[PDB]
Amino acid sequence: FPMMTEKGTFIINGTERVVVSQLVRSPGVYFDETIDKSTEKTLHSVKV
Amino acid sequence: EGGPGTGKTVVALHRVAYLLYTYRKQMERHGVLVVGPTPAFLDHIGRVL
């Protein structure tokens, strides 16, 4: 298993590499409202 | 449904105005449909709204 050094980096095949954090949408439940393209009405939706 | 001479029309127009004002924020996109022999109700809606 590759191990992290005291500097917060990895060594792979002699090269020094860094794994950057990733911003991702959390596994929540999200409600939203949008404007219909055709009728211009307000459409409410939710996705889990 | 009021009988003759009771002026139910005025009460109906006032009720329509009150309802459309109170729920205006959730009716400005759905719209309002007026059905009847004459558009007098639409005339009042335009007059007040």
Swiss-Prot record, chain A:
Residue spans crossing the bilayer? none
Could you list the residue ranges forming a coiled coil in this record? none
User: What superkingdom does the record give?
Assistant: Bacteria
Task: Give me the disulphide-bonded residues.
Answer: none
Q: Which family does it belong to?
A: Belongs to the RNA polymerase beta chain family.
State how it assembles. Answer: The RNAP catalytic core consists of 2 alpha, 1 beta, 1 beta' and 1 omega subunit. When a sigma factor is associated with the core the holoenzyme is formed, which can initiate transcription. Interacts with RbpA, which partially restores Rif-inhibited transcription.
What is the role of this chain? DNA-dependent RNA polymerase catalyzes the transcription of DNA into RNA using the four ribonucleoside triphosphates as substrates. This subunit often mutates to generate rifampicin (Rif) resistance. Interaction with RbpA partially restores Rif-inhibited transcription; once the subunit is Rif-resistant however RbpA no longer stimulates transcription.
An additional note in the Swiss-Prot or TrEMBL entry is: Mutations in the RRDR sequence (residues 423-449) confer rifampicin (Rif) resistance. Rif blocks transcription initiation but not elongation.
**Protein name as annotated:** DNA-directed RNA polymerase subunit beta
Query: In the UniProt record, what gene is named as encoding this protein?
Result: rpoB
Complete-protein stretch covered: 148 to 195 of 1169
